[PDB]
């Protein structure tokens, strides 16, 4: 029997932007990977950590929108390797703060290579579309 | 403690964050109609248009983790969504995608709504480049 193909993946904006994303995640966890034996959600963490000390993992979730399994795994293992602290509110301890520190600077140079292709414009352009599919585009979809 | 990563204001979150978003409001689709969590729909997509597709072939084309298809393989095979080292969609997979696929259509057209033709067209031309130059600028 014939198969309808019903969505065309490779043109489809919400298959082509969790791609990319997955691309970008994976490039930058090329710097801390193998160094430090860390996942990328739990990186992820880290980042929200040293941004808004004494978030919940609820809240960690809520804000990236990422699977609550997946975060409550993360700061699992972040809290036996001593990296966050809780008090619930977790935070960065001193030992997850010297990652940060170190792979923060590297993250922040692959980044700006990322965007080096845009010129200011272009730049601009995108996160001025993005902003209005977060603001406006998303309250449509239910 | 200074805040060395502005997540607010990095590309990278913002992407991932909307993405998450995007990909969450699709899922309740599918998850109120099979209890299917988003890895799994995925997969499904991929099987639909690339029937024979290895576990490692869905992740290759995906950029998904590896560990988490084979955990989303490994769960719809379980329920019958998928049957055999090629996998395809087993009548009820194929009957999950033709039911939820128009679905999310309809549902990304809305998402969609809030740009002209021009302004699509110009998102999707960024993202090109953002891939194709991007990408091999980082690493
Ligand atoms: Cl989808
Ligand atoms: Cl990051």
Redesign the interface.
Known sequence: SP?????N?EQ?????????????????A?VYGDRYGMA?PEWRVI??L??Y?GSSASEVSD?????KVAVSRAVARLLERGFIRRESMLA?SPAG?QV??TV??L??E??Q??????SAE?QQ???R??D???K???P???
């Open positions: 198969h309808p193909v019903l969505l993946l489809f904006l919400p298959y082509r932007l969790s791609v990319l994303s997955n691309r970008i995640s994976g490039n930058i090329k990328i980042t929200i040293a941004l000390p804000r990236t929108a990422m699977d960065l703060r940060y520190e923060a600077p993250v922040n692959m980044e290579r990322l965007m080096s292709v845009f272009e352009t995108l996160e579309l993005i209005r599919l977060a406006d585009g998303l449509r979809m239910a």
